[PDB]
Amino acid sequence: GSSGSSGLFTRDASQLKGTFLSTTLKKSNMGFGFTIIGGDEPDEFLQVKSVIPDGPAAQDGKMETGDVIVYINEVCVLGHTHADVVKLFQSVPIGQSVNLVLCRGYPLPFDPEDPANSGPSSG
């Protein structure tokens, strides 16, 4: 039924709970057909913030939203800064490809800033 919780971060990715899967996207013009979020902090799990509709990530079927970034190309990044990980994505020029390993079973982040609000509309 219900069950407990505790722990102290991941490390070897092995302590995540989910499936593990991968894709190779070739960087076609512009940039990959998804965008990322990371916690700001230098040990928060990075996630796909969105998939671009009609983008190559969507056309490979495999990229989904909320998915947790474990590794990029062949680098362990699951606690790296979104500063470094965004630099890692930018380090790939157009027409090259990278591997990505995500973990599956994680939801999207709840956004503590604004997850969905509005002001005094009547209704």
PDB file of C-alpha atoms in Angstrom:
ATOM      1  CA  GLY A   1       0.000   0.000   0.000  1.00  0.00           C
ATOM      2  CA  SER A   2       1.706   3.140   1.318  1.00  0.00           C
ATOM      3  CA  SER A   3       5.434   2.901   2.229  1.00  0.00           C
ATOM      4  CA  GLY A   4       8.112   4.998   3.948  1.00  0.00           C
ATOM      5  CA  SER A   5      10.759   7.444   2.728  1.00  0.00           C
ATOM      6  CA  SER A   6      14.270   8.604   3.794  1.00  0.00           C
ATOM      7  CA  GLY A   7      17.800   8.630   2.238  1.00  0.00           C
ATOM      8  CA  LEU A   8      20.617  11.028   1.271  1.00  0.00           C
ATOM      9  CA  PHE A   9      20.716  11.784  -2.504  1.00  0.00           C
ATOM     10  CA  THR A  10      21.522   9.143  -5.188  1.00  0.00           C
ATOM     11  CA  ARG A  11      25.177   8.646  -6.457  1.00  0.00           C
ATOM     12  CA  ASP A  12      25.646   5.746  -8.858  1.00  0.00           C
ATOM     13  CA  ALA A  13      22.133   6.287 -10.388  1.00  0.00           C
ATOM     14  CA  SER A  14      21.407   2.719  -9.191  1.00  0.00           C
ATOM     15  CA  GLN A  15      19.389   3.956  -6.177  1.00  0.00           C
ATOM     16  CA  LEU A  16      16.754   5.616  -8.438  1.00  0.00           C
ATOM     17  CA  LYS A  17      13.435   3.749  -8.821  1.00  0.00           C
ATOM     18  CA  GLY A  18      12.153   3.524 -12.383  1.00  0.00           C
ATOM     19  CA  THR A  19      13.084   2.142 -15.788  1.00  0.00           C
ATOM     20  CA  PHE A  20      16.331   3.305 -17.488  1.00  0.00           C
ATOM     21  CA  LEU A  21      16.392   4.171 -21.206  1.00  0.00           C
ATOM     22  CA  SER A  22      18.413   6.131 -23.765  1.00  0.00           C
ATOM     23  CA  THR A  23      18.318   7.914 -27.138  1.00  0.00           C
ATOM     24  CA  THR A  24      20.807   9.495 -29.569  1.00  0.00           C
ATOM     25  CA  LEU A  25      19.528  12.802 -31.011  1.00  0.00           C
ATOM     26  CA  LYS A  26      21.428  14.414 -33.882  1.00  0.00           C
ATOM     27  CA  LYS A  27      21.448  18.226 -33.320  1.00  0.00           C
ATOM     28  CA  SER A  28      19.468  19.377 -36.391  1.00  0.00           C
ATOM     29  CA  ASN A  29      19.922  23.125 -36.859  1.00  0.00           C
ATOM     30  CA  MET A  30      19.154  25.253 -33.736  1.00  0.00           C
ATOM     31  CA  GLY A  31      19.302  22.742 -30.849  1.00  0.00           C
ATOM     32  CA  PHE A  32      17.772  19.537 -29.499  1.00  0.00           C
ATOM     33  CA  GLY A  33      13.973  19.190 -29.551  1.00  0.00           C
ATOM     34  CA  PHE A  34      13.694  19.354 -25.720  1.00  0.00           C
ATOM     35  CA  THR A  35      14.700  21.719 -22.875  1.00  0.00           C
ATOM     36  CA  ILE A  36      15.941  20.962 -19.332  1.00  0.00           C
ATOM     37  CA  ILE A  37      15.455  22.230 -15.728  1.00  0.00           C
ATOM     38  CA  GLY A  38      17.770  21.756 -12.739  1.00  0.00           C
ATOM     39  CA  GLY A  39      17.220  22.660  -9.071  1.00  0.00           C
ATOM     40  CA  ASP A  40      19.693  25.658  -9.183  1.00  0.00           C
ATOM     41  CA  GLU A  41      21.658  23.940  -6.404  1.00  0.00           C
ATOM     42  CA  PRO A  42      24.839  21.832  -7.075  1.00  0.00           C
ATOM     43  CA  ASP A  43      23.118  18.475  -6.191  1.00  0.00           C
ATOM     44  CA  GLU A  44      19.522  18.444  -7.536  1.00  0.00           C
ATOM     45  CA  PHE A  45      18.298  15.921 -10.134  1.00  0.00           C
ATOM     46  CA  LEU A  46      17.993  17.513 -13.588  1.00  0.00           C
ATOM     47  CA  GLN A  47      14.769  16.904 -15.576  1.00  0.00           C
ATOM     48  CA  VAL A  48      13.435  17.426 -19.110  1.00  0.00           C
ATOM     49  CA  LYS A  49      11.408  20.680 -18.586  1.00  0.00           C
ATOM     50  CA  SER A  50       9.627  20.137 -21.923  1.00  0.00           C
ATOM     51  CA  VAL A  51       9.867  18.164 -25.119  1.00  0.00           C
ATOM     52  CA  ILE A  52       9.579  20.365 -28.234  1.00  0.00           C
ATOM     53  CA  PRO A  53       6.497  19.193 -30.195  1.00  0.00           C
ATOM     54  CA  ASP A  54       7.427  18.334 -33.858  1.00  0.00           C
ATOM     55  CA  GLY A  55      11.116  18.282 -32.739  1.00  0.00           C
ATOM     56  CA  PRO A  56      13.541  15.330 -33.266  1.00  0.00           C
ATOM     57  CA  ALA A  57      13.266  14.329 -29.580  1.00  0.00           C
ATOM     58  CA  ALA A  58       9.508  13.840 -30.070  1.00  0.00           C
ATOM     59  CA  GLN A  59      10.120  12.151 -33.487  1.00  0.00           C
ATOM     60  CA  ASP A  60      12.427   9.533 -31.804  1.00  0.00           C
ATOM     61  CA  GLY A  61       9.416   8.883 -29.482  1.00  0.00           C
ATOM     62  CA  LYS A  62      11.704   8.472 -26.481  1.00  0.00           C
ATOM     63  CA  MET A  63      12.092  11.912 -24.892  1.00  0.00           C
ATOM     64  CA  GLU A  64       9.208  12.618 -22.479  1.00  0.00           C
ATOM     65  CA  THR A  65       8.589  15.505 -20.086  1.00  0.00           C
ATOM     66  CA  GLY A  66       9.597  15.214 -16.400  1.00  0.00           C
ATOM     67  CA  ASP A  67      12.199  12.533 -17.320  1.00  0.00           C
ATOM     68  CA  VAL A  68      15.332  12.662 -15.066  1.00  0.00           C
ATOM     69  CA  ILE A  69      18.755  13.179 -16.743  1.00  0.00           C
ATOM     70  CA  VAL A  70      21.206  10.626 -15.392  1.00  0.00           C
ATOM     71  CA  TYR A  71      24.079  10.790 -17.937  1.00  0.00           C
ATOM     72  CA  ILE A  72      24.908  12.889 -21.030  1.00  0.00           C
ATOM     73  CA  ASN A  73      26.993  11.529 -23.929  1.00  0.00           C
ATOM     74  CA  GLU A  74      29.252   9.526 -21.613  1.00  0.00           C
ATOM     75  CA  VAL A  75      29.400  11.782 -18.464  1.00  0.00           C
ATOM     76  CA  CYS A  76      27.681  11.273 -15.050  1.00  0.00           C
ATOM     77  CA  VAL A  77      25.621  14.481 -14.511  1.00  0.00           C
ATOM     78  CA  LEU A  78      22.722  13.522 -12.139  1.00  0.00           C
ATOM     79  CA  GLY A  79      23.979  16.004  -9.453  1.00  0.00           C
ATOM     80  CA  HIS A  80      25.846  18.417 -11.815  1.00  0.00           C
ATOM     81  CA  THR A  81      24.861  22.078 -12.060  1.00  0.00           C
ATOM     82  CA  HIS A  82      22.286  23.069 -14.701  1.00  0.00           C
ATOM     83  CA  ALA A  83      25.050  25.601 -15.477  1.00  0.00           C
ATOM     84  CA  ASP A  84      27.450  22.747 -16.482  1.00  0.00           C
ATOM     85  CA  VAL A  85      24.699  20.593 -18.115  1.00  0.00           C
ATOM     86  CA  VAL A  86      23.450  23.523 -20.222  1.00  0.00           C
ATOM     87  CA  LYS A  87      27.129  24.117 -21.207  1.00  0.00           C
ATOM     88  CA  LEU A  88      27.354  20.393 -22.083  1.00  0.00           C
ATOM     89  CA  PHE A  89      24.347  20.680 -24.440  1.00  0.00           C
ATOM     90  CA  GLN A  90      25.784  23.884 -25.996  1.00  0.00           C
ATOM     91  CA  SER A  91      29.211  22.170 -26.435  1.00  0.00           C
ATOM     92  CA  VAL A  92      27.581  19.951 -29.146  1.00  0.00           C
ATOM     93  CA  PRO A  93      27.656  21.823 -32.500  1.00  0.00           C
ATOM     94  CA  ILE A  94      24.957  21.477 -35.169  1.00  0.00           C
ATOM     95  CA  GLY A  95      25.013  18.180 -37.089  1.00  0.00           C
ATOM     96  CA  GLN A  96      26.618  16.158 -34.230  1.00  0.00           C
ATOM     97  CA  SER A  97      24.848  13.776 -31.841  1.00  0.00           C
ATOM     98  CA  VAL A  98      25.040  12.837 -28.172  1.00  0.00           C
ATOM     99  CA  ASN A  99      23.760   9.933 -26.080  1.00  0.00           C
ATOM    100  CA  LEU A 100      21.398  10.623 -23.133  1.00  0.00           C
ATOM    101  CA  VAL A 101      20.295   8.244 -20.311  1.00  0.00           C
ATOM    102  CA  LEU A 102      17.062   9.125 -18.505  1.00  0.00           C
ATOM    103  CA  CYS A 103      15.170   7.410 -15.647  1.00  0.00           C
ATOM    104  CA  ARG A 104      11.393   6.821 -15.907  1.00  0.00           C
ATOM    105  CA  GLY A 105       8.734   6.863 -13.183  1.00  0.00           C
ATOM    106  CA  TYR A 106       9.636  10.361 -11.930  1.00  0.00           C
ATOM    107  CA  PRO A 107       6.925  13.028 -12.414  1.00  0.00           C
ATOM    108  CA  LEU A 108       7.553  16.603 -13.452  1.00  0.00           C
ATOM    109  CA  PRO A 109       8.759  18.896 -10.675  1.00  0.00           C
ATOM    110  CA  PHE A 110       6.191  20.818  -8.748  1.00  0.00           C
ATOM    111  CA  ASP A 111       7.206  24.469  -9.330  1.00  0.00           C
ATOM    112  CA  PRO A 112       7.258  26.221  -5.905  1.00  0.00           C
ATOM    113  CA  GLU A 113       7.514  29.698  -7.572  1.00  0.00           C
ATOM    114  CA  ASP A 114       4.271  29.381  -9.616  1.00  0.00           C
ATOM    115  CA  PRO A 115       2.850  25.951 -10.670  1.00  0.00           C
ATOM    116  CA  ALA A 116      -0.454  27.539 -11.992  1.00  0.00           C
ATOM    117  CA  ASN A 117      -2.045  30.641 -10.355  1.00  0.00           C
ATOM    118  CA  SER A 118      -4.202  33.627 -11.490  1.00  0.00           C
ATOM    119  CA  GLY A 119      -5.513  36.915 -10.011  1.00  0.00           C
ATOM    120  CA  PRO A 120      -9.091  38.175  -9.285  1.00  0.00           C
ATOM    121  CA  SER A 121     -10.975  37.003 -12.363  1.00  0.00           C
ATOM    122  CA  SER A 122     -14.605  36.590 -11.269  1.00  0.00           C
ATOM    123  CA  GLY A 123     -16.191  33.197 -12.139  1.00  0.00           C
TER     124      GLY A 123
END
